[PDB]
Design a protein around this ligand. Structure first.
Ligand SMILES: CCCCCCCCCCCCCCCCCC(=O)OC[C@H](COP(=O)([O-])OCC[N+](C)(C)C)OC(=O)CCCCCCCCCCCCCCCCC
Ligand SMILES: CCCCCCCCCCCCCCCCCC(=O)OC[C@H](COP(=O)([O-])OCC[N+](C)(C)C)OC(=O)CCCCCCCCCCCCCCCCC
Ligand code: SF4
Ligand code: SF4
Ligand code: SF4
Lengths: 176, 49, 155, 318, 115, 45
């Protein structure tokens, strides 16, 4: 099925021609829009007072990457390198090693934020929920080197945004 | 009478924000005029309304 | 002594610059659409004195919004080189900051910094409108911490 | 104290133009669901100061492919004519009682072409050279309609003394006698000031700016000052010309208040129109006046010259 | 005097604005700024070439109409005459000639913005 | 526990209007011309 959009040709009686002549001469649709915009002027302005008020978000929000850790304090990352094999932009780099305790943690774990495209593929790839993307988006930096994160920076991110990530995961792990 | 009602509310918010000094401080610093319930206070000193 | 007068005067000047920076739009990809959302009613860039619309002759800040390709680079260079001082350039989006998804391309430069100086690096793919706005506010605080006439007087 | 009165004319007009740049950004935004500037001081009251300081201390770039003489003279002409064209306005007691005030001000209204042309050509850019001729054609082709409308309206006033215009209206608003005429006049005013429905010179797809392209900082801001001073001046002209007001000689302030309210209302109508309508095309732009506006204006002028004769109601000459 | 004093005040005021505008700010004065502009590029080798145009006809019919507008300007003074009948017929002649010139402009392309 | 997810209410959902309900407003063209001419005539009187 389909509908013809513009076939409504006008009539030609005296009333219709008088109405059309009035609309053309005594500008009416012009006044119609001019009055609609007036109605929008008196309405309630849609505007959020940044940074005092922030936009609504969701528990699935993808933002700054961070390396979580177990309740015992041990980092969850076992350096399976699945996230490195998954990142479409290849922004993740890991070097692993047999630690002094033995658990295979990352000697190097850096995410190039300028290469990252913020997809959330790493977290869904992680089999221990080690790498995640925190709710933070307020990390606009001044130098390009500031963006290139390190393992220590990722650990600090996971130790600062931690109650956030734990609460969001608790509210989202059932969906995923 | 809603006009005088909103005038009264506009003069009420100047009392809600701790008098003239607090109201002017809020207007100049936070770009806000309205008053909401204090739902909490963090350690660093931010009021949550 | 002179620091009092010169500091008050240059504080006035840098405040005036800070509250009236005029973006030179320059949207190349989806980052442009996100910036456009950032000028929408919700966040209302225009409230802060930023005006979004600006010819490159009358503008203060360039937002490099999107991937910058090799064919584009001379045009962006001529645009910035004509930009009157002061001229702070903010790079939005992982693509413009450096590389991007198409980092290892053949006709995409690996960062706006290799083309033009970047004053604020805004990350995101795309940087959600309020993150862009926060980068703008960071540039505003940068303009606040400006000591031009202080350095002149203390050269 | 004459020079004091002069300064009391210029300076307040300068603050009026300055805060028009705030009221437009607030009115437009509220018309399109935006809060507008309210960060620089209370309700954005201080915002025009900051942008003015920035534009004063912004670098004024010298157009390398230009002769600086006109690059400097054109802002002088545009700004000085715009302000001195406020001189003969009937405030309850007009500053200068020029016997031909309306013709005086209409003649000066044509001079904006003499800033437009030098700006467009001296700056020496494609956008500038295009927009110079396009805007020149716009304003000159609407100046004629302004002229016949002024003549036809005045034929019921009595003379070109613009102070007696109040005496003409007194009882009834003059629009009640020339609403078909004013409806054209107002629109032609919209055309002469280059506003969004009729601007055609900015055209931020193919002209970008048209005349104020290479102008930067101060000389650039001077043309904005001229442009947003012509807004207030022509809205005030229309206000007295058609929207009359009372004036008791023992209380001059009453007509002042009524007149400023009328001017603010008309300027708000300007912002109202620009915030809604699309932008004309040069083809349609000149089609609007050559094909449609001009014949109606000619016929209305004929009607308004024949009417006082047949009604035996010729206006008093003195 | 008076009027001339106002014109003097306005022109000097405008000149002070332009002087502060062009002198107060500081410029590094580097060469590549002088490169001209066109939406990102420069205006190649143009912006001064002779302008092959068509609305020249509209521009000249402007002037031709402006003469007649000048002719009909004295009307408000003219309506204060004893022999109103002749003034009525002859002013009506002037506006009719306005309309006839516009009509000949119309049908014979003319005011139709040339292509 | 039974399986649950984001589902429409059992009564489905309320109707969603999509027809252009552009309002009609304004006097007749004859009425507009008549009122304009009457205002004119009062002005000339
Ligand atoms: C009404 C406006 C009242 C305030 C006017 C302020 C004028 C500011 C001019 C622009 C900034 C330059 C300035 O303040 O001093 C120039 C001085 C000039 O001397 P300078 O050595 O500091 O300039 C910077 C270095 N060079 C010369 C290489 C460009 O520059 C600065 O202050 C910028 C640092
Ligand atoms: C001579 C050279 C200079 C010529 C220009 C005139 C003199 C300089 C400008 C003087 C006024 C502005 C001074 C700087 C103000 C500033 O930075 O912040 C102001 C601030 C604005 O605060 P704010 O809202 O920007 O604070 C920051 C807000 N956040 C954190 C959200 C970004 O307000 C004040 O300091 C209070 C007083 C303001 C003015 C009071 C009067 C207003 C009503 C009358 C206005 C019209 C007549 C004037
Ligand atoms: S979102 Fe994470 S996994 Fe995906 S590309 Fe960016 S850094 Fe790599
Ligand atoms: S997928 Fe998880 S556990 Fe595997 S290397 Fe990446 S962060 Fe470590
Ligand atoms: S950073 Fe992301 S959103 Fe921005 S241009 Fe590149 S792919 Fe698009």
């Amino acid at each position: 099925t389909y509908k013809f959009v513009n076939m409504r040709e006008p009539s030609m009686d005296m009333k219709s021609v008088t109405d059309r002549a009035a609309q053309t001469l005594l500008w009416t649709e012009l006044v119609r829009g001019l009055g609609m915009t007036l109605s929008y002027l008196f309405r309630e302005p849609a505007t959020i007072n940044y940074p005092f008020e922030k936009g609504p978000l969701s528990p699935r929000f993808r933002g700054e990457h961070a390396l979580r850790r177990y309740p015992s304090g041990e980092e969850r990352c076992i350096a399976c390198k699945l996230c490195e094999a998954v990142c479409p932009a290849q922004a993740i780099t890991i070097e692993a090693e047999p630690r002094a305790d033995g658990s295979r943690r990352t000697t190097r774990y850096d995410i190039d934020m300028t290469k990252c495209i913020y997809c959330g593929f790493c977290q869904e790839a992680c089999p221990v929920d080690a790498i995640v993307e925190g709710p933070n988006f307020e990390f606009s930096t001044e130098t390009h080197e500031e963006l290139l994160y390190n393992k220590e920076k990722l650990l600090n991110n996971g130790d600062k945004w931690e109650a956030e990530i734990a609460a969001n995961i608790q509210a989202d792990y059932l969906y995923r | 009478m809603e006009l005088v009602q909103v005038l009264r509310r506009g003069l009420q918010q100047v009392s809600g924000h701790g008098g003239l000094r607090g109201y002017l401080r809020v207007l100049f610093r936070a770009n806000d005029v309205r008053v909401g319930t204090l739902v909490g206070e963090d350690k660093y000193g931010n009021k949550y309304y | 002594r002179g620091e009092y007068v010169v500091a008050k005067l240059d504080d006035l000047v840098n405040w005036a610059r800070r509250s009236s920076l005029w973006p030179m739009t320059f949207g190349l990809a989806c980052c442009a659409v996100e910036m456009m959302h950032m000028a929408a009613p919700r966040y209302d860039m225009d409230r802060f004195g930023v005006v979004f619309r600006a010819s490159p002759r009358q503008s203060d800040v360039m937002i490099v919004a999107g991937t910058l390709t090799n064919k584009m680079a001379p045009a962006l260079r001529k645009v910035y080189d004509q930009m009157p001082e002061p001229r702070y350039v903010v790079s939005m989006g992982s693509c413009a900051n450096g590389g991007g998804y198409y980092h290892y391309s053949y006709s995409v430069v690996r960062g706006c910094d290799r083309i033009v100086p970047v004053d604020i690096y805004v990350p995101g793919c795309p940087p959600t409108a309020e993150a862009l706005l926060y980068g703008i506010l960071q540039l505003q605080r940068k303009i606040k911490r400006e000591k031009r006439l202080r350095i002149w007087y203390r050269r | 104290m004459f020079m004091i009165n002069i300064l009391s004319l210029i300076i307040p007009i300068l603050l009026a133009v300055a805060f028009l740049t705030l009221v437009e950004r607030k009115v437009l935004g509220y018309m399109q669901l935006r809060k507008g500037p309210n960060v620089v001081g209370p309700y954005g009251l201080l915002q025009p100061i900051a942008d003015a300081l920035k534009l004063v201390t912004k670098e004024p770039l010298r157009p390398g492919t230009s002769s600086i003489s006109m690059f400097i003279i054109a802002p002088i002409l545009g700004l000085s004519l715009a302000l001195t064209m406020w001189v003969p306005l009937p405030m309850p007691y007009p500053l200068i009682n020029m016997n031909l005030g309306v013709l005086f001000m209409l003649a000066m209204s044509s001079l904006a072409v003499y800033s437009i042309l030098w700006s467009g050509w001296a700056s020496n850019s494609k956008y500038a050279l295009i927009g110079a001729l396009r805007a020149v054609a716009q304003t000159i082709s609407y100046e004629v309609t302004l002229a016949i409308i002024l003549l036809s309206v005045l034929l019921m006033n009595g003379s070109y003394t613009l102070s007696t215009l109040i005496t003409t209206q007194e009882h009834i608003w003059m629009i009640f006698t020339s609403w078909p005429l004013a409806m054209m006049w107002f629109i032609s005013t919209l055309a002469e000031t280059n506003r969004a429905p009729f601007d055609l010179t900015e055209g931020e797809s193919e002209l970008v700016s048209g005349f104020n392209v290479e102008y930067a900082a101060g000389p650039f801001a001077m043309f904005f000052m001229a442009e947003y001073a012509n807004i207030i001046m022509m809205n005030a002209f229309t206000a007295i010309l058609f929207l009359g007001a009372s004036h008791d000689p023992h209380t001059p302030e009453l007509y002042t208040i009524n007149f400023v309210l009328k001017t603010l209302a008309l300027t708000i109508t300007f912002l109202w129109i620009r915030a809604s309508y699309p932008r004309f095309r040069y083809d349609q732009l000149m089609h609007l006046l050559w094909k449609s506006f001009l014949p109606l204006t000619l016929a209305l002028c004929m009607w308004h010259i024949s009417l006082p004769i047949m009604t035996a109601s010729i206006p008093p000459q003195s | 005097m008076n009027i001339m004093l106002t014109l003097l005040t306005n022109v000097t005021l405008a000149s002070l604005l332009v002087l502060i505008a062009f002198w107060l700010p500081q410029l590094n004065a580097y060469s590549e700024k002088t490169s001209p502009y066109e939406c990102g590029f420069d205006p190649m080798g143009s912006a001064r070439l002779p302008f092959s145009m068509k609305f020249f006809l509209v521009a000249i019919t402007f002037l031709l109409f402006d003469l007649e507008i000048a002719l009909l300007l004295p009307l408000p003074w003219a309506s204060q005459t004893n022999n109103l009948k002749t003034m009525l017929t002859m002013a009506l002649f002037l506006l009719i000639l306005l309309a006839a010139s516009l009509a000949y402009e119309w049908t014979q392309k003319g005011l139709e913005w040339a292509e | 526990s039974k399986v649950k997810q984001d589902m429409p209410p059992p009564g489905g959902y309320g109707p969603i209007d999509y027809k252009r309900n552009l309002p009609r407003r304004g006097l007749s063209g004859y009425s507009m011309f008549a009122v304009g001419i009457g205002t004119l005539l009062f002005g000339y009187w």
